[PDB]
Design a protein around this ligand. Structure first.
Ligand SMILES: [Cl-]
Length: 288
């Protein structure tokens, strides 16, 4: 563990500090091509409006399938990609776009059927007016999204950069009711990075003190569900490996991600950030 901390630091010296290797790797990464990588379903005429960003469409081989029988639009399609870590049965996350007005019922169906109870949201809803994600929850009281009643139970504001919202999610078909906890990071702007890595890391720690430990996937979204969402996942997967002890390849770990959803980590600056974040956390642990 501390052992693996020093192993990560060694890696950081060769891949974060050496700017040449950063570039080279990112250049490698940009050209990297997943196989398979078809997204024919996502590119159907019928699913065009269910996609926010034409640049980031879920692969046919790695998409969440809504149960068409319970679907709002009688369709299985949602732009969400399961993301496996250890286990090919149980994906650790579902990365998905910011739900659109057209797809909110769908987003909740995926939350219900995935058994998900922790959501991570890494965008504000608007950026100097530029919409990122539809306001898919009620700011007070109850809203109905198809057969999914969502009630806002409470809302806890930790700091300038993040808050938590607690929901009750009732399936009106089955009369069941679950608590879904939504972690909302507010200072991570489109195609950019947080100013404080310390905030994003504490935010992560809070996400995981609440998740620990559940079968169901964490639902991570932002905008395209690639850039920020992927930097989170990448940062979070690499520290989990430290969490449980040998070898470390962050570039290779990112490939594993891009095998499962295109676009993951949109910028070299974001990649640089994910690295800097892992390093800083590992500097803190080892300091103690
Ligand atoms: Cl089909």
């Amino acid at each position: 563990d501390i052992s693996t901390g020093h192993m990560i630091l060694s890696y950081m010296e060769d891949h974060l500090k050496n700017k040449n290797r950063l570039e080279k790797e990112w250049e490698a990464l940009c050209a990297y091509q997943a196989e398979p990588n078809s997204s024919f379903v996502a590119q159907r005429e019928e699913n065009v409006p269910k996609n926010r960003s034409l640049a980031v469409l879920t692969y046919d081989h790695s998409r969440v399938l809504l149960k068409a029988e319970n679907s709002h639009s009688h369709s299985d399609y949602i732009n969400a990609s399961p993301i496996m870590d250890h286990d090919p049965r149980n994906p650790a996350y579902i990365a998905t776009q910011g739900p659109l007005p057209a797809t909110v019922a769908d987003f909740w169906q995926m939350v219900w059927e995935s058994g998900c109870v922790v959501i991570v949201m890494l965008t504000p809803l608007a950026e100097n007016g530029v919409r990122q994600c539809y306001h898919y929850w009620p700011d007070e009281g109850s809203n109905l999204y198809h057969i999914y009643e969502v009630n806002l139970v409470s809302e806890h504001i930790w700091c300038e950069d993040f808050l938590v919202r607690s929901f009750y999610l009732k399936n009106l078909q089955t009369n069941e009711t679950r608590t879904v906890t939504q972690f909302h990071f507010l200072s991570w702007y489109d195609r950019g990075v947080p100013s404080s890595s310390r905030s994003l890391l504490d935010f992560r720690r809070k996400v995981n003190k609440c998740y620990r430990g559940r079968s169901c996937p964490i639902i991570v979204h932002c905008s395209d569900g690639a850039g920020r969402s992927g930097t989170y996942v990448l940062i979070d997967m690499v520290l989990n490996k430290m969490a449980k002890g040998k070898e470390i390849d962050i570039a290779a770990t990112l490939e594993h991600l891009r095998d499962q959803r295109p676009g993951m980590v949109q910028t070299k600056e974001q990649f640089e950030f994910a690295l800097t974040a892992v390093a800083e956390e590992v500097n803190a642990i080892l300091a103690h």
